Design an enzyme around this catalytic site. Structure first.
Site, PDB file in Angstrom:
ATOM      1  N   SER A  53       0.806  -1.215   0.000  1.00  0.00           N
ATOM      2  CA  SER A  53       0.000   0.000   0.000  1.00  0.00           C
ATOM      3  C   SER A  53       0.852   1.284   0.000  1.00  0.00           C
ATOM      4  CB  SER A  53      -0.971   0.024   1.167  1.00  0.00           C
ATOM      5  OG  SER A  53      -0.320   0.420   2.359  1.00  0.00           O
ATOM      6  N   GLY A  66      -2.889   3.258  -3.522  1.00  0.00           N
ATOM      7  CA  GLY A  66      -3.991   2.563  -2.881  1.00  0.00           C
ATOM      8  C   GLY A  66      -3.450   1.338  -2.182  1.00  0.00           C
ATOM      9  N   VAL A  96      -2.884  -3.065  -2.664  1.00  0.00           N
ATOM     10  CA  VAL A  96      -2.850  -4.199  -3.584  1.00  0.00           C
ATOM     11  C   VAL A  96      -2.906  -5.469  -2.764  1.00  0.00           C
ATOM     12  CG1 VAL A  96      -1.634  -5.275  -5.569  1.00  0.00           C
ATOM     13  CG2 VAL A  96      -1.476  -2.814  -5.218  1.00  0.00           C
ATOM     14  N   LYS A 134      -6.348  -4.268  -6.796  1.00  0.00           N
ATOM     15  CA  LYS A 134      -5.924  -2.927  -6.376  1.00  0.00           C
ATOM     16  C   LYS A 134      -7.123  -2.053  -6.078  1.00  0.00           C
ATOM     17  CE  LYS A 134      -3.506   0.446  -8.841  1.00  0.00           C
ATOM     18  NZ  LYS A 134      -2.303   1.068  -9.502  1.00  0.00           N
ATOM     19  N   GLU A 140      -3.427  -9.221 -13.644  1.00  0.00           N
ATOM     20  CA  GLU A 140      -2.845 -10.554 -13.723  1.00  0.00           C
ATOM     21  C   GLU A 140      -1.735 -10.651 -12.690  1.00  0.00           C
ATOM     22  OE1 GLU A 140      -1.593 -11.818 -17.740  1.00  0.00           O
ATOM     23  OE2 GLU A 140      -0.224 -10.095 -17.840  1.00  0.00           O
ATOM     24  N   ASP A 167       9.554  -8.530  -7.321  1.00  0.00           N
ATOM     25  CA  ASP A 167       9.728  -7.121  -7.636  1.00  0.00           C
ATOM     26  C   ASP A 167      11.206  -6.902  -8.022  1.00  0.00           C
ATOM     27  OD1 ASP A 167       9.216  -4.328  -7.443  1.00  0.00           O
ATOM     28  OD2 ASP A 167       9.413  -4.286  -5.253  1.00  0.00           O
ATOM     29  N   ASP A 195       6.555   6.308 -15.020  1.00  0.00           N
ATOM     30  CA  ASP A 195       7.129   5.979 -13.726  1.00  0.00           C
ATOM     31  C   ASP A 195       7.862   4.656 -13.854  1.00  0.00           C
ATOM     32  OD1 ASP A 195       7.756   6.621 -11.022  1.00  0.00           O
ATOM     33  OD2 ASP A 195       5.943   5.548 -10.275  1.00  0.00           O
TER      34      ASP A 195
HETATM   35  N1  LIG Z   1       5.711  -1.943  -6.357  1.00  0.00           N
HETATM   36  C1  LIG Z   1       5.274  -2.887  -5.318  1.00  0.00           C
HETATM   37  C2  LIG Z   1       5.838  -4.281  -5.560  1.00  0.00           C
HETATM   38  C3  LIG Z   1       5.407  -5.274  -4.465  1.00  0.00           C
HETATM   39  C4  LIG Z   1       3.881  -5.250  -4.197  1.00  0.00           C
HETATM   40  C5  LIG Z   1       3.346  -3.826  -4.014  1.00  0.00           C
HETATM   41  C6  LIG Z   1       3.751  -2.955  -5.200  1.00  0.00           C
HETATM   42  N2  LIG Z   1       3.092  -1.672  -5.287  1.00  0.00           N
HETATM   43  C7  LIG Z   1       2.250  -1.480  -6.356  1.00  0.00           C
HETATM   44  C8  LIG Z   1       1.836  -0.198  -6.685  1.00  0.00           C
HETATM   45  C9  LIG Z   1       0.925  -0.013  -7.688  1.00  0.00           C
HETATM   46  N3  LIG Z   1       0.536  -1.146  -8.385  1.00  0.00           N
HETATM   47  N4  LIG Z   1      -0.267  -1.185  -9.471  1.00  0.00           N
HETATM   48  C10 LIG Z   1      -0.367  -2.523  -9.773  1.00  0.00           C
HETATM   49  C11 LIG Z   1       0.463  -3.317  -8.959  1.00  0.00           C
HETATM   50  C12 LIG Z   1       0.629  -4.800  -9.010  1.00  0.00           C
HETATM   51  C13 LIG Z   1       0.000  -5.549 -10.010  1.00  0.00           C
HETATM   52  C14 LIG Z   1       0.112  -6.910 -10.048  1.00  0.00           C
HETATM   53  C15 LIG Z   1       0.897  -7.606  -9.092  1.00  0.00           C
HETATM   54  C16 LIG Z   1       1.126  -9.009  -9.152  1.00  0.00           C
HETATM   55  C17 LIG Z   1       1.897  -9.632  -8.208  1.00  0.00           C
HETATM   56  C18 LIG Z   1       2.512  -8.904  -7.206  1.00  0.00           C
HETATM   57  C19 LIG Z   1       2.332  -7.547  -7.118  1.00  0.00           C
HETATM   58  C20 LIG Z   1       1.549  -6.856  -8.078  1.00  0.00           C
HETATM   59  C21 LIG Z   1       1.400  -5.445  -8.067  1.00  0.00           C
HETATM   60  C22 LIG Z   1       1.037  -2.388  -8.033  1.00  0.00           C
HETATM   61  N5  LIG Z   1       1.873  -2.560  -7.016  1.00  0.00           N
END
Ligand SMILES: N[C@@H]1CCCC[C@H]1Nc1ccn2ncc(-c3ccc4ccccc4c3)c2n1
Length: 274
Positions: free
Chosen positions: A14, A18, A20, A35, A89, A96, A135
């Site tokens: 978060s 928002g 996730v 999300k 998905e 990450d 970004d």
């Molecule tokens: N950048 C972070 C990596 C670890 C999880 C939280 C993440 N923060 C965000 C911020 C914005 N978004 N918008 C979409 C995602 C996203 C989408 C799919 C995912 C699938 C698996 C794991 C994390 C995921 C995160 C997301 N994650």
């Protein structure tokens, strides 16, 4: 229809984006990410052809979700009174690029090369679809650790690609170009190429090159790790202080450092498996 065709799991993260969550689609046990975006925190709004006022991320993800691509696909979305919920998905196992660099440090050039090429391929796809991410960073790139395929995430600071100047930046400052810092003005592709230079240095050095605005304005890069002269050359080119002096995605991909790239599966077998 209702929004209980998904089974909620652990909160993945978060922030301003928002919240996730890891989810599962009840109909076929398909892994998904859920999300939740608060309506108050939506900066840039979009509109679907049918008139529905939605977050821009939905507009941009629908423009690029006509897969296959190196972009996390929007499977569905829902509107609630004070929020919007996106169903995306979820690769599994997944990591990450930020956490991957936190654990393993500076990446070997063969791994950085495979990863960097896939980002270029993904960004080119978004641009080919008239979308600009805005970004690009390690935090916004997931690794499918079995297939060795990378995928872009978070189009919440993105925009429709345009040939005129942008005077709005809701991205990571340390990844922002000198022209934004100084004039609060940039062009899409050249600002995307700057961020790609911050990304490649981050991959091969284990950290971003610039922490403060003066280092950005100066744009002089010191290499803390053993990095090949061709890689340093591409990095410095991507990080040219004048936008016009930066390369195009074609020139990046035709650079001698970007030759003999591995395929996603080869990368996973050599560098990610076990
Ligand atoms: N950048 C972070 C990596 C670890 C999880 C939280 C993440 N923060 C965000 C911020 C914005 N978004 N918008 C979409 C995602 C996203 C989408 C799919 C995912 C699938 C698996 C794991 C994390 C995921 C995160 C997301 N994650």
């Amino acid at each position: 229809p209702l929004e209980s065709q998904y089974q909620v799991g652990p909160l993945l993260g978060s922030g301003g984006f928002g919240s996730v969550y890891s989810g599962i689609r009840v109909s076929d046990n398909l892994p998904v990410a859920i999300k939740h975006v608060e309506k108050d925190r939506i900066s840039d709004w979009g509109e679907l052809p049918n008139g529905t006022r939605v977050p821009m991320e939905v507009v941009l993800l629908k423009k690029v979700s006509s897969g296959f691509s190196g972009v996390i696909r929007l499977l569905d979305w829902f509107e609630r009174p004070d929020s919007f919920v996106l169903i995306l998905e979820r690769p599994e196992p997944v990591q990450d690029l930020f956490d991957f660099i936190t654990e393993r440090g500076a990446l070997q050039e063969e791994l950085a090369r495979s990863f960097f090429w896939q980002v270029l391929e993904a960004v080119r796809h978004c641009h080919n679809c008239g979308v600009l991410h805005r970004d690009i960073k390690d935090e916004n790139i997931l690794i499918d650790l079995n297939r060795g395929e990378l995928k872009l995430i978070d189009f919440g600071s993105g925009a429709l690609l345009k040939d005129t100047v942008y005077t709005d930046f809701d991205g990571t400052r340390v990844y922002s170009p000198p022209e934004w810092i100084r004039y609060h003005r940039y062009h899409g592709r050249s600002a995307a190429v700057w961020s790609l230079g911050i990304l490649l240095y981050d991959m091969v050095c284990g950290d971003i090159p610039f922490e403060h605005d003066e280092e950005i304005i100066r744009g002089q890069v010191f290499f803390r790790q053993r990095v090949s002269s061709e890689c340093q050359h591409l990095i410095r080119w991507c990080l040219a202080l004048r936008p016009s002096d930066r390369p195009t995605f074609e020139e990046i991909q035709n650079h001698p450092w970007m030759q003999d790239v591995l395929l996603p599966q080869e990368t996973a077998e050599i560098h990610l498996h076990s």
